[PDB]
């Protein structure tokens, strides 16, 4: 299947063959282990069309991630340690903080981290420039919850890049994927990251490959998904970068523009 058809085929397989399995909430899912889909990034952008995806949220959260921000306010549950720092909106050493300063000893969210920890994201961009053929062009993200982090906790997601013939491809592997909410969002998010990296390294985007471990549908999303399945996908839009950008830190929300986006209406999901 192709384009958004893969994602609809995957919703359908989970509904038909998914097995009931409970998550840590204790809420119910239909679950299938192991799936993959590929979305071309060539002259199109996989912002799903069978429901409207919150594009602007996708962009803004990615910029906040790229900044390595740990300040919740700068943005717009069992994750918890601290008193006045929670009121502050200080999240601790989480999210983008791992992409930019992995393993840095953490002070405060207005504290200064240049040159501290590993900059995974500059590392990716640097390797693409120094050796495009490299099979290790890999960046990892963690769920805030697992972050004891002395514990050597496993990543939530892993992102591998790949270059051939001038085209930058990305594979995202997620240990679990919420198919109703998280997945359409994550597909746009990492396809956007790919476009950004490709832009500053002089490559053209190639393929985005999305791989999951526990691919799941929340019980309360079945009916709305059953209805999304009856909708016919429309051609994906295009994503245009507006000025010439040189450094990953220099991007701004106004640098990007989506075009030809005609989704079906918003679907709201609990
Ligand atoms: O040093 C480390 C290396 C890889 C991973 Br994953 C860790 O969680 C860690 O603490």
From Swiss-Prot:
Source taxon at top rank: Eukaryota
CDD domains assigned: TS_Pyrimidine_HMase
EC number: 2.1.1.45
Cross-link (Glycyl lysine isopeptide (Lys-Gly) (interchain with G-Cter in SUMO2)): 247, 252, 268
Pathway(s) it belongs to: Pyrimidine metabolism; dTTP biosynthesis
Impact noted for substituting residue 120 to H: In DKCD; uncertain significance
One annotated GO molecular function: thymidylate synthase activity
Location in the cell: Nucleus; Cytoplasm; Mitochondrion; Mitochondrion matrix
Active site: 155 (nucleophile)
Reaction equation(s) it catalyzes: dUMP + (6R)-5,10-methylene-5,6,7,8-tetrahydrofolate = 7,8-dihydrofolate + dTMP
Amino-acid positions noted as binding dUMP in the UniProt annotation, renumbered to this chain: 24, 135-136, 155-156, 175-178, 186, 216-218
Binding annotation for (6R)-5,10-methylene-5,6,7,8-tetrahydrofolate: 178
Keyword Mitochondrion: yes
Disease tied to this protein: Dyskeratosis congenita, digenic: A form of dyskeratosis congenita, a rare multisystem disorder caused by defective telomere maintenance. It is characterized by progressive bone marrow failure, and the clinical triad of reticulated skin hyperpigmentation, nail dystrophy, and mucosal leukoplakia. Common but variable features include premature graying, aplastic anemia, low platelets, osteoporosis, pulmonary fibrosis, and liver fibrosis among others. Early mortality is often associated with bone marrow failure, infections, fatal pulmonary complications, or malignancy.
Assembly and binders: Homodimer.
Protein name: Thymidylate synthase
Source organism (scientific name): Homo sapiens
């Amino acid at each position: 299947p192709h384009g958004e058809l893969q994602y609809l085929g995957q919703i359908q397989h989970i509904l038909r063959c998914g097995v009931r399995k409970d998550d840590r909430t204790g809420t119910g899912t239909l679950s299938v282990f192991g799936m993959q889909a590929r979305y071309s990034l060539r002259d199109e952008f996989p912002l799903l069309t069978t429901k409207r995806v919150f594009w602007k949220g996708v962009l803004e959260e990615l910029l906040w991630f790229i900044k390595g921000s740990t300040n919740a306010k700068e943005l717009s549950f069992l994750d918890s340690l601290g008193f006045s720092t929670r009121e502050e909106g200080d999240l601790g050493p989480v999210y983008g903080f791992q992409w930019r300063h992995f393993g840095a000893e953490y002070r405060d969210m207005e504290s200064d981290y240049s040159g501290q920890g590993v900059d995974q994201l500059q590392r990716v961009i640097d390797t693409i420039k120094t050796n495009p053929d490299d099979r290790r062009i890999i960046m990892c993200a963690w769920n805030p919850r697992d972050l004891p982090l002395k514990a050597l906790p496993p990543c939530h997601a892993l992102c591998q890049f790949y270059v051939v013939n001038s085209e930058l491809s990305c594979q995202l592997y997620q240990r679990s994927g919420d198919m109703g909410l998280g997945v359409p969002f994550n597909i746009a998010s990492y396809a956007l990251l790919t476009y950004m990296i490709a832009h500053i390294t002089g490559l053209k985007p190639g393929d985005f490959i999305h791989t999951l471990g526990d691919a799941h549908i929340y019980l309360n999303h079945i009916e709305p998904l059953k209805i999304q399945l009856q909708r016919e996908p429309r051609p994906f839009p295009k994503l245009r970068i507006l000025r010439k950008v040189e450094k990953i830190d220099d991007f701004k929300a106004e640098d990007f523009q989506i075009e030809g986006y005609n989704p079906h209406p918003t679907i709201k999901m609990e």
